[PDB]
Amino acid sequence: GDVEKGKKIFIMKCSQCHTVEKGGKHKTGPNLHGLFGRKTTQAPGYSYTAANKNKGIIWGEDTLMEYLENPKKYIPGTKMIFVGIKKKEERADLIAYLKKATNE
Ligand code: HEC
């Protein structure tokens, strides 16, 4: 998990909809601080879909590896309009970046 490659992926593919800093503002998508070890639909103040609430999983490496390959397939009906990342390494590198940036 290369975080520098993952940071560069996050800017290209997520940064327009997401922030990672603690106390970062909600944008189109929720602020991602505290993502790891947290159930879905748990960012305070963000309006999720009923689909995201119906999932009810714990966000970690394995659930993020499968979600980011195809979000519509993992959480059907989600309003996150992202096609997905096909390459293992980009998802693994991006998750390595998320593990450091979202944990303050
Ligand atoms: C807008 C154009 C987005 C882009 C690009 C990315 N995301 Fe996203 N994300 C967006 C929305 C609107 C939502 C809410 C989904 C819903 O149904 O309510 C999300 C959600 C997530 C989540 C789940 C957060 C949670 O369950 O608490 C994660 C983990 C997430 N987004 C990550 C993520 C990554 C890693 C992205 C790029 C690689 C990315 N998102 C792109 C909006 C948008």
Give dist(CA 93, CA 4) in Å, integer: 8
**Is residue 17 in contact with ligand 1, taking CB distance under 6 Å?**
yes
Which residue's CA lies nearest to atom 18 of ligand 1? Answer: 48
What does the alpha-carbon distance between residue 101 and residue 48 come to, in Å, rounded to a whole number? 22
30 Cα to the center of ligand 1, angstroms: 7
Atom of ligand 1 nearest to the CA of 98: 35
Amino acid identity, residue 25? K
Distance from residue 62's CA to the centre of ligand 1 (Å): 16
Of 32, 60, 67, 61, nearest in space to 46 by CA? 32
Is residue 28 lining ligand 1, measured as CB closer than 6 Å?
Answer: yes
Overall resolution, Å: 2.7
The DSSP code sequence of 6-75 is HHHHHHHHTTTT---STTPPP-SS---TT-TT-BSS-STT----HHHHHH--B-SHHHHHHHTT-HHHHS
What approach was used to elucidate this structure?
X-ray
Domain-wise residue ranges, the chain: 1-104
